[PDB]
Structures are given as structure tokens and as C-alpha cells.
Amino acid sequence: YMEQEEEWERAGLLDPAWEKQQRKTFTVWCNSHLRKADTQIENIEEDFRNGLKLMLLLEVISGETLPKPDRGKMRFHKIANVNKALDFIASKDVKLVSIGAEEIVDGNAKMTLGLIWTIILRFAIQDIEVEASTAKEGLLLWCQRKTSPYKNVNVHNFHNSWKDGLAFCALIHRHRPELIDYNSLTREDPVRNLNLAFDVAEKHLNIPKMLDAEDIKTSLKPDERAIMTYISSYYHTFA
């Protein structure tokens, strides 16, 4: 009973601020891959309902070919396409704990964001191996190692450790010192630091601006899934 709401709490999906952060961040992440297939989404709670761009997203990030999709106005075609997506994901050793094609075709916001996170996790994070840690803990360890020389960075988590922008700027500076005047930065202007990292990463590293500095600024504890999504692109660009 209320198993789904317990999982949604931990997913961040009951908090509307975290839901909004995931909606915005996940849309940019999906488009950072769909661009390679010359298309895009606009509204993540509408534009996957027929399964077509979901299947395409999975082909791009996996390099594999999925079965041919159906087309037709009628719902059962959309259900079939979403099920082809879900089958492909499950085939990569993913436990789809209560994600059904019907809710995706229905455009249920929480299930759709949960599904996109499942995809980000499996394909962008799960295989990360850093020392003896894997997946999310490996990604966090990478961040801790790469930012260890910076005295004004202390990465403990994927939320408030990232709020003042210095950790993002440090990750960039550690790989490319010529792009960031790191010593000029301080904790006093977090929005400046955040936007610096986001602008530099978009310009020089081809990493789109998945995070909104204003959403981070106003949150005492920003959404972990959104921040992990963005940092996963840092990881795969440098490592």
C-alpha cells in the first residue's frame, strides 16, 4: 500500500520543485542526444506519449537498433511502441518496478520522469567505475577526487555541495585551468559561479545547459537526479 508514493518520495517526484527541476533538466539531456538524430522534444510529458522519440532516444544512446515502430492514430500503436522501449530497457538488466506503457501513453508526469531517470541511470551512470565504487557512488567519488585540491569545495552529495557553483567550476578547471579564473571566484556570488560553469561547459565542452542557476539558487537542497544527470555529461566528456 502506497509503495509507489514511498518510492516517489525518494525519487524526488512528490516535491513540485524537484519535479520541475527534473522536467527541465531531463528535457535538455534528452535533446542533447536526440539532436544527433536531427530531432527534439519540447514538452517531456507530451512528446514521448506515442513512443517514437523514446525509441529513438534509446537507439542514439545505446548505438543499437530497436524493432521497427508502429504508426497510427490509435492508442494501441502508442502502447506497442512504448512497450518496445520498455522491453529494450529491461533487456539491459533493469527492474521496471511499476512502470507501465499505459501511464506513459497517458502522459503521467511522475511515471514519465521516473522512466527517463531509469534511462539516464542505466545508460549514463550505471557503468561508471571509479576505484571500487560504481554507478552513483562512483560518479560522486570521481567528483570528490577531481575537486580534492580546492579548499573552498567540499563535495559530500549531489545537492547542496553544488549550490554555490564552485564545485562545477572546479571540475572544469581541474581538466582545462585555461578556461576558468578559479581564484577570482568566491562564495558570495553563487549565481555568477553557476552561470560561469554552465556557460563555459556549453561553449567549450559541448555540454548543454541542463541546469538553471535560478532554480539552484532558490533551493536549499536542489534535486539530486537533475544534478547527477548534468554531472554525468561532465564525466563522459573527460573520462
Numbering used by the authors: 37 to 275
Copied sentences from the primary study:
The genome of malletwood is the only known plant genome that contains a gene coding for an α‐actinin‐like protein. The results clearly show that this protein has all properties of genuine α‐actinin. The R. argentea α‐actinin‐like protein dimerises in solution and thereby can cross‐link actin filaments. Based on these results, we believe the R. argentea protein represents a genuine α‐actinin, making R. argentea unique in the plant world.
In order to characterize its structure and function, we synthesized the gene and expressed the recombinant R. argentea protein. The N‐terminal actin‐binding domain (ABD), with two calponin homology motifs, is very similar to the ABD of any α‐actinin. The C‐terminal calmodulin‐like domain, as well as the intervening rod domain, are also similar to the corresponding regions in other α‐actinins.
